[PDB]
């Protein structure tokens, strides 16, 4: 509350560390469904169904331009990528499997870097 604060957690490396995680996600062999925004002219149903499209290149641009206020807003966008994937793709598909694999990969790196 006013003039009452928990000890200050060092957040000075968070930007660099999120960048490193995102590089590792970009270079994973199962990243290909997520590298670029889904083409809303060429994929029927996407635009109407997925209210907030998100992809790794969009996260990279937001990260590089100071559009994440803290590490939690970064994680929310990464998770959005996988939540959108599950919304639109069957589990038993190459893309559906890719999204589960990448979400697991991400959640481990996240815990190990920050928890």
Q: Which positions ≥6 away from 74 have C-beta within 8 Å? A: 18, 59, 63, 68
Positive or negative: CA dihedral 21, 112, 54, 11:
negative
Question: How many CA atoms lie less than 13 Å away from 12 in the CB half-sphere?
Answer: 2
CATH 1.20.1300.10 corresponds to the domain 1-115: no
The full DSSP string for 21-63 is HHHHHHHSTT-TTTSS---TTTSTTHHHH-SS---HHHHHHHH
Listed in sequence order, the residues at least 6 apart from 62 whose beta carbon sits closer than 8 Å to its beta carbon are: 68, 77
Backbone angles phi, psi at 31, to 5 degrees: -75, -25
| Domain spans, the chain | 1-115
The resolution, in Å, is: 1.7
Q: In whole angstroms, give the CA distance from residue 13 to residue 29.
A: 27
Integer Cα distance of 14 and 108 in angstroms: 16
Backbone angles phi, psi at 40, to 5 degrees: -70, -20
């Amino acid at each position: 509350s006013m003039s009452v604060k928990k000890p200050k957690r060092d957040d000075s490396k968070d930007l660099a560390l999120c960048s490193m995680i995102l590089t590792e996600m970009e270079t994973h062999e199962d990243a290909w469904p997520f590298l670029l925004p889904v083409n809303l002219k060429l994929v029927p149903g996407y635009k109407k169904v997925i209210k907030k499209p998100m992809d790794f290149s969009t996260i990279r641009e937001k990260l590089s331009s100071g559009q994440y206020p803290n590490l939690e807003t970064f994680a929310l966008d990464v998770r959005l990528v996988f939540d959108n994937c599950e919304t639109f793709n069957e589990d038993d598909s190459d893309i559906g499997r890719a999204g589960h694999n990448m979400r697991k990969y991400f959640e481990k790196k996240w815990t190990d870097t920050f928890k």
